[PDB]
Amino acid sequence: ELQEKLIAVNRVSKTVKGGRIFSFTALTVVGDGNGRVGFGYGKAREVPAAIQKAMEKARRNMINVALNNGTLQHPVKGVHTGSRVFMQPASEGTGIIAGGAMRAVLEVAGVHNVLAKAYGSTNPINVVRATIDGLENMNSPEMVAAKR
Amino acid sequence: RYLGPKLKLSRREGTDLFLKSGVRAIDTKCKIEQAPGQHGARKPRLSDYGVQLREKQKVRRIYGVLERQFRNYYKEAARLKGNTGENLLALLEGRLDNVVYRMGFGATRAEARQLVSHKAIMVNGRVVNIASYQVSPNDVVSIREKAKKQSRVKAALELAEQREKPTWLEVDAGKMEGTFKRKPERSDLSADINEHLIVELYSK
Amino acid sequence: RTLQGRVVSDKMEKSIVVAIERFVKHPIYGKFIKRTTKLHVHDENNECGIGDVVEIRECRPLSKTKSWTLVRVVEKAVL
Amino acid sequence: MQDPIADMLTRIRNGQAANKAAVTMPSSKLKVAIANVLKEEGFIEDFKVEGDTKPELELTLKYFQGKAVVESIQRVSRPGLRIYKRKDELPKVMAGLGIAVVSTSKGVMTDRAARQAGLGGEIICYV
């Protein structure tokens, strides 16, 4: 069934009036591997409490990547905040060559081969979004033909 | 290679790795179950990066290989088609030194690596003294005619009798030969490894 | 070699200078660049005058600066 | 103008933005040659030569629910810097979903049309 992947976890600390309250954050990637992905980022006092809460949010917000022979349709360049992400399809026998933040989202996405890179800001939280955003702008011939 | 105390790596990995006398009740992991050092008794606190790290660790420890080639083979297996995890074990399981071990010619991969380097092992006639040699299917791996006398292999193959071999292999105690049928799948291999945890680590 | 240029001067005798111009791409940028060169062609018959766009061909070095000679006049005049 | 081709392309990129039925554009053999691929591919209904005294190209644009028949369309080869691609340089516009018009000796054709013929040329524009 659905498969999860922990991108990264941050301690996170804020100076609240009365002392220091700690709240852990966590980036999770839920995906079956045949065309669906899900990014979640929830907070919690405990690490596991955030991990679980994150996976729940990731499964609530999923997208459908139109995979084609273990690859993507056309190249895309998503630009979230200061961060930037680019994607480019590649023939078989290539391998998911990209950042851990993107690869983890691509592996579960079902993508078998793809070339990518991060530009501008490289924030792990901003790159994942730019990644899922680019996976949305993705279109197929049937879509471009039907929508036209 | 590491070259050193292997009976300590087993406990450290939590799992009982087969380095040598893993069969006898002498294996420290059987007497005491905990990593080496003084902090082996205290309750460990592993993290995400921890499970993945210690995961590939035992993986590379089993075959006893450097971190370089182990990483190189990962890139390759991850390049070709098919599930990476599956291909991974395939390449590592294809190593000559490894094959020799599975065949029974050597008590372990460490001893097997030695046998190969000592030119005491041949492949399809011609001899091969490189442990990092990739053994393909239909390739026969037998002992050297001159090495057919050394007591070491004489005792190893002697114990090999009656002992079953993997489905991806087939040896002949009599001729002291062997054949590499095909590439072993994750189903055939029963290693205490989680191919999905080792891949995530290299993802970062 | 045949080169095309203009007669920017006919002061000397039997010696006319032809200003040949060419267009070549920049080795780095690639954009076309304009470059000309003055060649002292021979004209014993003092036929060619200033403003004449004639053709130039390689011939026996009449001198150190002159190694070309007038062949044919393309047009009549364009000062 | 500076680059008639770019003008036409823009005058069409504009008409579609305002959802105009038809758009005018000064005629030209090259222009017509282009409009020929736009109608065949399915970017436009068709076109017709109009003009009382001045030759024009009444282009009849078509639309659909959702996105326009021509989302993007821009010239990559301008007079300031011409570009030429070889048989293996022809880039597949949007994984093939879209096409690119190139001017070769064989005549004005698209990526697939030029790829088949086995020749390359100046990349007019992408659509």
Added chain:
Amino acid sequence: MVTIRLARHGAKKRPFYQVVVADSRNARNGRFIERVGFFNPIASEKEEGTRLDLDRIAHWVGQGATISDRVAALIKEV
């Protein structure tokens, strides 16, 4: 003086000479004009000890190309 001698590819445990027609000035293992064959002292790599290619050298012979003493022996063996 154009001469036809042997070009030693000589390597640790690998003796192979290349009967080539080159100028006498050029080094023993320098730029040669054209190879006409090869020579294997031990003749272990291949069964074909040498391949003179008569017709080839037959051209240089008379063109002014002189053959050394050693090479002449191999050449004569054809």
Added chain:
Amino acid sequence: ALEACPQKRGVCTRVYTTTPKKPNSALRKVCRVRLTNGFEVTSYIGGEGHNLQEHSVILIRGGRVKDLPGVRYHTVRGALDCSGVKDRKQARSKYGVKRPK
């Protein structure tokens, strides 16, 4: 180092002591050295005790002392007149101190 050389010799001009900055307070041992490069810079003297006089002549390594603003070089003990630290049980690789029998 001028010639971008790993090490450079030089004759000491004066072996005086200096005091750390605001966050610290002590008597760090330094010495002005006239490297063959033609420059007269100050170098720090590692160890709990040295034997550098006026005509010391010691090889300079190159290291900035966060405590002493200016001392961008360190002295290589164990070379030339700079006798290595005595009874150095730990840092022997540095300061130059032969392993006792």
Added chain:
RNA sequence: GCAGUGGGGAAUAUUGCACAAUGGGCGCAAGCCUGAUGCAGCCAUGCCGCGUGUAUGAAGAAGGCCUUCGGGUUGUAAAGUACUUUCGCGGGGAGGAAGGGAGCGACGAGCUCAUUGACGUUACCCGCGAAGUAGCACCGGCUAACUCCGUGCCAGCAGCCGCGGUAAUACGGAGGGUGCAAGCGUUAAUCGGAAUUACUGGGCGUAAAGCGCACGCAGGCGGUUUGUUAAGUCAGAUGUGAAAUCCC
């Protein structure tokens, strides 16, 4: 010029052996010359199969190490034994090249035969055969690897963020641990990350940044139609594509 000496410097070696082989000069040839070169020596400076060991080994009574003082760890024992099998000794002794000479033939071609092995004895093979040293750096974070004791903004640590005023894992010591497995650390030097000159990859209202304006030369750019030339541009063939290399 080769080897070497002294000086300088942080610092880099045998004033060794020898010509048979390959190659070169001269001679018809015989043959002569040739530290060109072929080797050995000194220095782990580097790389490859073994720095402080390899393999074997007792539910494990000592010692070193760590410790929440329960324990755990080093587990040839921390003893021994054997080892990959070093070193060392004896014998044989390579070319990864055959002639010079002599016999047959016109001491020419060709054929045949003999001497000489390492370079005026290394490698490798065979035999014998003793286990036969071991240390440094570091352990707050980046950097993988822990506490007790001492001291106490005291003494000291620090590339940056910092730490130390009686619980300091970053001070000194000790037990333990990580790294190196003579490498690993350290110092010095070269390249990119920097899309921070950005042709591919960039900006100029307020962050660094548009000339105060007009006008105007060169230059850049510039409507449309036709013809000739076709110099630029593009295409085919051919020559060179220095060799070497980059790439496969």
